[PDB]
Amino acid sequence: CGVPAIQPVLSIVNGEEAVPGSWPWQVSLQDKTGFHFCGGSLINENWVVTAAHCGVTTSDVVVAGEFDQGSSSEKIQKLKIAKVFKNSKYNSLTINNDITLLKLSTAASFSQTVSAVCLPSASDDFAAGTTCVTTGWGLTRYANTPDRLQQASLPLLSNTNCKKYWGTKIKDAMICAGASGVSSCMGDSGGPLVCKKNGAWTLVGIVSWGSSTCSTSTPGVYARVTALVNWVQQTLAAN
């Protein structure tokens, strides 16, 4: 996990186009017509982790190995969802514990462009200031989504600095990043916020919420994976 066969090249609002297939765990969650409503991350061949507010159902599909959503010829994997596991602790009012697991009907076929992201340990400490990366097909301007996968490098923010803006809206299962000239935006939700752990890309956050206008000067808020990974492991073990 966490090691792309195709290495990404780094120099979402104000992000940049990613190298095709360089973020193999990134999936697009679409309805039966192919409409992209959220992103997600493969954690293994049979499971995808995304945001709870995305409201995924077994009627939606997981699209893996995609780069250009405008290309009909591009080879991809449309995977059906067998069951959806929304964290029962998801708070629809505070948005805390914003995570959902998707169990695929048929396993994804891992390859050069399709593989898993690593999951952190509940005790992992990713320091504030750490430069991480987020990816997705969300709006690049606050409008239709970009056809090609975008990426952006951004720093993790301490809860103290994040609260300087969002105050008490920041809960224990949330982690902030950004306010650095880039911003996640409509369509990015459920997607990954990854940071390197001993050289491997590890899922530290899941795109959740933030500026209602996708402002690049405001902290972006993500579901804190370290606070939710035990639930992830327990769910996989029992299913």
């Binding site: 959220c38 945001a51 948005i95 996640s184 369509g187 939700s189 459920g190 919420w209 500026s211």
Partner: protein
């Protein structure tokens, strides 16, 4: 008469999803589609045009 929430403009919310929902547009008299972010939906937000028209039609 119809609920006043039917006269409120569509509300995307702070979440970053791209979910298709319907809202009643009193200026046109029809329910139109809009992008909902996934959380904190206001009441003029429906999963189908039919639900929207049955709740806000004519406002």
């Amino acid at each position: 008469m119809r609920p006043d929430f039917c006269l409120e403009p569509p509300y995307t919310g702070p979440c970053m999803a791209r979910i298709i929902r319907y809202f009643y547009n009193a200026k046109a008299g029809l329910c139109q589609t809009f992008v909902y972010g996934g959380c904190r939906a206001k009441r003029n937000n429906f999963k189908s045009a039919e639900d929207c028209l049955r709740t806000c039609g004519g406002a």
